[model samples]
Every structure is written in structure tokens, then in C-alpha cells.
Target: AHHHHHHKMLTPAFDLSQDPDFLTIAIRVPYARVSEFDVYFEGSDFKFYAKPYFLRLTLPGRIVENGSEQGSYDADKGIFTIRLPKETPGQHFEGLNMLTAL
Candidate 1:
């Protein structure tokens, strides 16, 4: 109600999927406010914050955690798909550790 911030939080349910191109986490915004979301990450976890809801989750595989992303949402299916490009092609997140250690 004040002018400070809206920290009142909500968490939503979602799905996980993967392929050669990217890893995906699909969440529902069934009322269709799909365009309001943005993502951020830390350690093994990532967050999805949007106009309708907010949630945080860990990726199943170690990925290129510090890379750019692309996403799209389906209005008919009510699913918001976050496409995260894998960090390392063959190796684990071991490469990222080199960055952290530096």
C-alpha cells in the first residue's frame, strides 16, 4: 500500500523439460499475463518473477548458469516457457567453477 516495494510473494507450480538446444521450465499464468516475466539466477537456483506470480527453482543439470536466455509463452496452453541455453557442451558446470575460483 505504501510507495516502498511489493515484497508480498507468491510461488507457482511448473514443469521441466530439456533438449539439445536448451533447458525449459514451464509455468502457468493461465489468466494470460505472459509478457510480464523476467528471470535471474544464483548458485544452482533460478527465479522467475512476473506480473502475475513469482517462483524459484534449481535446474536439473549443471548448465552455463551465466549465459543469456530466450523465451516464449503459449496463450492457448497457458504455459510460459523459459529457454536456458546449456552452459557447457560436453563437460559439467566444472568450467563455471573456473570463473568462480578466479
Candidate 2:
């Protein structure tokens, strides 16, 4: 059997410090064969969080959060939801960008 491979590309917005409450992540694939993709948030030099963040059917947007328990992706509508906690005045949340294929 011949196996078909699809190429996936990630076009992420990583400078999230400007807005601590929300993040708008995006990925643009060349073909429609890709079913899903995973978004991984990294801290310092280690993997902090990993989740299945999907591309929307009608729009081009992904939701990422400042905290771990407050993020989700809507595959049907292509919307990402992020719930952020109140800022601590002087402290700021920090992390890196990571992505994977599914």
C-alpha cells in the first residue's frame, strides 16, 4: 500500500507577554489531510504543558492560556478558549512555544 504523507506548518505568535490574559496561536497547513495538531508550552528548557489544539473550519484562530487548566480548542468551529487568572501586579507568566503533529 502507498502511504500518503502530509506536510504541516506552524505559524505561532510566541510573544505573549504583551497580553498576559490571552494568546492567539495559529497554524497554516498546505493541505487538508492533517487531522489535528498539538500545542506544547515550554518553560525554561522543559516541557510544561501539552494539549490537542485544532484548526478551525471557518476561522483562523487558536486559544492559549496563561495557566494550564484554562485552555481548550474547538475543532468544529476552529476556536481556542483561554481563561486567565488575575494578574499579581509585579509577577508575570512566562513560557516558550512548542508544536507537534497528530
Candidate 3:
């Protein structure tokens, strides 16, 4: 559990939804510990890492980190909730239900 060897990892299940101003991603990592994960959001790429758990989602719309982004972890459900503001307000993101494409 202390080595960082290169190998294949698993991708967690996640859901995507959005409002007029923000895109919400709900990632499920059943074995992850609280505060032990890291998230990176740049443009349309979203990445997350938590030891054995990892996830990457490319949004159809671009998002920005303008100090208003919010993240919350629900330990009870083992879910990580991330809210990112869209680059263009009211811009609709397509292919949200297509998990294979994201």
C-alpha cells in the first residue's frame, strides 16, 4: 500500500447533470477515505484520484475554476459531489448520459 508502481487501475462510476450555470458530477468511490482524494479540473477535463480509485470525465462544455467551485464528500454514500461553473453561462452540455463517451 506504500508503493507507487505503474499499473492499470479502475474507473469509478459517476453521474453528470447540469443547471444553467453549473455542471454537477457525482462520482462513486466505495472504498475511498474522506479527504484522501484529489481532483483536478481544467477546461473540459475532469480527473480524480483516491488511492485505488480513479475517474476521468471529459465534459462536452468547458468549465472554469473561478474560486466559486464547490466539492463535497458524502461518506454515507461514498460519493463525491463536484460543482463547476460553466465557461459560458446557460451553455448546454450534451452527451451527459453517455457514460462511454465521457
Candidate 4:
């Protein structure tokens, strides 16, 4: 006989939206702790990791990679918000748009 193990994973529910000047993302992580997670955002792409969830997302539109964007996590509400600034309206963004990172 042999011993083996498999780990099941889950993804947090998220919402992605865009406005005239901003691309916004909201992730619902009601049971995760903010300070205990990892988040990386740059070059129009981002990866986020928290308890019971992980996401390496490709942006669906064009945006600037400047450091003027914003993000926040609310422990009480258990939600994460990321807002990115858009650059060209019709221009294309060339880079990674989606993947899985742990």
C-alpha cells in the first residue's frame, strides 16, 4: 500500500468592472485575514493570495502601470478592492492577463 494526498482549492468570488478612467476589482473574502495574505500588482496584471483563495488575473483592458492606483482590504467587511487607472481607450495592453499562482 502507498500513502498519497490531494489538496482541493477554492477561489474567492470577485467582480471586475471599468469606468471612463478606472478599472476596478472587488474580491469577496469574508473569512480571510488581510495581514496574513500576499498581493502583487504591476504592469496591468496582478496576483492575490489569501487563505482559501488565490488569483493571478489578467486585466481585460488597457491601463497604465503607474503607481497612482489604489487598493484596500477591510477586515470587518471581508472584502478587497483594487482600482487601476486606464491609459488608452482603444490601445492594447501586451502582457500576462490571467494565470494561477500560489
Instruction: Residues 1-102, candidate 2: write the lDDT tens digits.
Output: 899996633332222222443333333333324444443442221121223223322111233335543545556654444333333422343432323222
Q: Residue-pair clashes per candidate, as listed?
A: 1, 2, 0, 1
My TM-score estimates for the predictions, one after another, are: 0.61, 0.28, 0.84, 0.65
Q: Which candidate should be chosen as best, given TM-score against the real structure? A: 3
lDDT of 1 by residue, 28-100 (tens): 7775344667878654577777755777665545546555677787878877888777765543332222221
**Range of the 10 consecutive residues with the lowest summed lDDT in candidate 4:** 93-102
Error of 4 at 48 (Å): 1.3
So what's the TM-score on candidate 3? 0.84
Q: Give the C-alpha lDDT of model 1.
A: 0.63
List model 4 lDDT by residue over 1-102, tens digit each.
Answer: 999996534588787766667777787888674467666766556787886778777675555776867888887888888877777654433332342233
Better of 2 and 4 by lDDT: 4
Worst 10 residues of 2 by lDDT: 44-53
Let me know the TM-score candidate 1 reaches against the reference structure: 0.61
Can you tell me which runs of candidate 1 are displaced by over 4 Å? 1-9, 32-34, 65-68, 90-102
Each model's lDDT comes to 0.63, 0.34, 0.84, 0.69
